[model samples]
Target: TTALVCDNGSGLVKAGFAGDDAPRAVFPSIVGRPRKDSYVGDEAQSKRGILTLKYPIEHGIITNWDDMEKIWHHTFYNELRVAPEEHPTLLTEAPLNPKANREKMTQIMFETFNVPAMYVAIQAVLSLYASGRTTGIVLDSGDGVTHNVPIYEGYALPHAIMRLDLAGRDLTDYLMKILTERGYSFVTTAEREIVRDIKEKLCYVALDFENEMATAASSSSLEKSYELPDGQVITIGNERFRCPETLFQPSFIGMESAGIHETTYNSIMKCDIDIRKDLYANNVMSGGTTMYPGIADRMQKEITALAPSTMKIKIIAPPERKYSVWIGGSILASLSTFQQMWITKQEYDEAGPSIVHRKCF
Candidate 1:
């Protein structure tokens, strides 16, 4: 019996059958409202040029349940061509998910879709399970925000959760901001796609900020040439490093918050001294932003320096951060031992959505 799992990430909704190594489809989280007043994926933004984006989730909060329900209907019926009624469904939610959102989610599963069983697991916990660790600190930097969640034996410590409101969207904006400063202007709705493509292709975290900047200025080795859709070849210079630098230096943006590793360090300090070592040793990194080159090394170096000199910090950023949580969910649901962990429809019928609050691990 294969279960269906969905990693309803802020940037994208990744879903597929359980036991698969990867999700069947990854689509934008926004529900595109076209000129016809019909709802669809981000594809409408391109096909219809002028369209409104209805995002169900904003900055890790599931705000518009209606849009999310529509997106899930599309995902289950159109994207994967599967029947949610025939399979038990599982979802990965934000670490700081609210009670109202959980109630709505449970409603959608049992009342709306009528699945046999359902479970909601925190994304950070799924990430840890994917890495084969029961206890550790998970740094999840995605499109909306970055979160540092400490898990002990598969349960998350919500109080110690650290968040950075800066993530991939911020990176794209900074890239555009820095590029504009360099006489490059891309401001249209569709033009943002080009900016995102540029960010995905050329951005990288630097091992040494001063040295990297100096080298980028002095030599043409890192010089990259990207062609616009209209055959204009634009050369990329220091903006490549400048865009990703915001991740390590939040000051680069308007916010005065700590960098990714610093917050991870701060979160570890909140934990017990006995488990801090274990948490530091099994650091698991997930999310699209972690795909940037040299990020793991920089995170490791930064966290190791801030933590006690003797504490060993190793960060493992899964190669595909986009679907790592869903992959982890698939792995978990595929296990025989996980069968009893789900909150069955009968339990939901008995106690309503509150069953998720009690039955969920």
Candidate 2:
């Protein structure tokens, strides 16, 4: 049996045998073709390259069909070292997907892969399995999307789920713009590449925004600089590099989007009042974004501030922030109880799309 797990946030395509130690192979959600004979993992991210690059999923949805198909085929056949005979594939997609995209994807998995069986799951629900919890809020900050999904009784609270277009990609783009304004001239391709690396390594969410800013303002921290891969020493002084803090304070970027705490609080309040108490008591953060240093502590602080003084808020992170869903999928695949959750080929052949719809939805 084969399993495919895709997370657009991290641009990962993980596939392998069901019971393997890990994914047989994992590739970036990006596709880059330098020539007819050469292809690259979302690795060729530079903007001024001769390579044709495509991000199949933008804002958590597939936008390019031809390029995406070519990349997927090349990735599976060449990179994954998998043969066409593989059957019983498991695939993942976004929550509340558009009907058209769902139909298109279903067609691709069934018609293209010719897999005997397929299972589609939302990443947030998978996190529940990873944490062994039936209810909580899942905050996923990925490349193109930051989602706040509430899970209750092993199912997603569809109405309470929210998404923001601002994510790691947006942060990268913003940082690139900042660098360009500061007299750094490079191809968009190179700028994005370097900015992403810098963001990942240097960025931090300010625990005390005003106090941190004041401290940096009064100190000689501005004189401190880090050398970039490009051999340039970028000074990060009193200027305050607080881009990552935007996740906690969306207003910092002036988008008026809700921060992690507000979203979680609202989601809990919207649920049954009784469930609200239990949900907050078991909040779980399981996404690539949660892996950021200080995320869990920051979330806990913010949640505590917003929640009732009498109530306690606990935010927990799974073991592997990036692949918690895949781990959850692995756990589910290994479970005797979850066996009924899968729709076999016979069920699909007889009941058709309804079976998949019911099983998943």
Candidate 3:
């Protein structure tokens, strides 16, 4: 028997046949449409004159049905070389996925592909598989969304998992707005591309936000400059490029935004005291946001400060933090003990739409 694992994220879609050495391919979720009939992946990024690109999935859900379907078909069939007749496939979606969306997706998987079988799971659940811990917290911060999930006994604590509107997309938008105010006139395409690169290369979570700000205010840190892809050198004092700092101080970006710690705390508070205890014992950070250098250490320092002194705070940064969900699915695919967690063709046929509503626990 063989299994296929697909980890779809706001930034990238990672899919491959299970039990192989590694993922067959990982493609950027963004699709550049240079023409009506042509779509490109990473290569299109370098093209000088691209008509328009669409991120089919926005805020962790499919934004455009036609574009999404086209991208999925291209990725699965052309990129991965996984014909529908091959094996059972497992695709990860967001938690609290819409019913209509699920139904549409299911129809596409079964009717369009005519695949033997297909299973759907949440990205958060797959991320937990990377740690191999039965009880813990999974903080997934990606381009479009951030999800905080509490896991106990290999099951997600639904009430304790919370999502926020502010994410990488929010940061990108914020930067674009700031750039516009600074007289940089560029289209959203150019602005988004530059902001994303800036976030990845220069943004970082500041542990002591106020202190860092004070330092930047008092010193000449603002004189530091970074070169943009457009060959323009922008000088930013320490306080000038505080976009990354917003992860710790979401309010800094705008009004009444919850910081990462506040969101995590609220999610924990929704759980029973015992389950909350389990969270304190095991805290794991997974996702692209966690890929920021010094992020784990900074998160631990801030979260620990927020908690009681007696309580221990351990933040485990799994290997390959960016691909934690994919790795977790890989681990699950190889483990016989967890094989039952996956839905089969017969189960999909029997359960139908109910299958999407079922949780692993």
The candidate that achieves the highest TM-score relative to the unseen native structure: 1
lDDT per residue for candidate 3 within 51-140, as digits (tens), equals 476788877888788777776787777888767657667777786778788767776877677667666666777777777786888888
Q: How many times do residue backbones clash in model 3?
A: 1
Q: Per-residue CA lDDT of candidate 1, range 1-361, in tens? A: 6899988878888889999989988888877775455555656556555667777888778988888888888888888888788888998788778988898899889998888999998888888888888899999989989999999987898878999999999999989888878787786775778889999998888888889999987899888988998876668888888888898899999889999988999998898888899899988888888789889898888887888888878888878766678888999889899899898989999999988999877
Ranking by lDDT: 1, 3, 2
Question: All models: lDDT?
Answer: 0.85, 0.67, 0.72
Best by lDDT: 1
Worst 10 residues of 1 by lDDT: 35-44
Q: Which of the two candidates, 2 or 3, achieves a greater TM-score against the reference?
A: 2
Regions more than 4 Å wrong, model 3: 20-24, 30-35, 38-54, 176-192, 217-225, 228-231, 235-241, 346-361
Clash totals in order: 0, 4, 1
- Lowest lDDT block of 10, candidate 2: 1-10
Residue 361 displacement (Å), model 2: 4.3
RMSD of each: 1.5, 3.1, 3.3
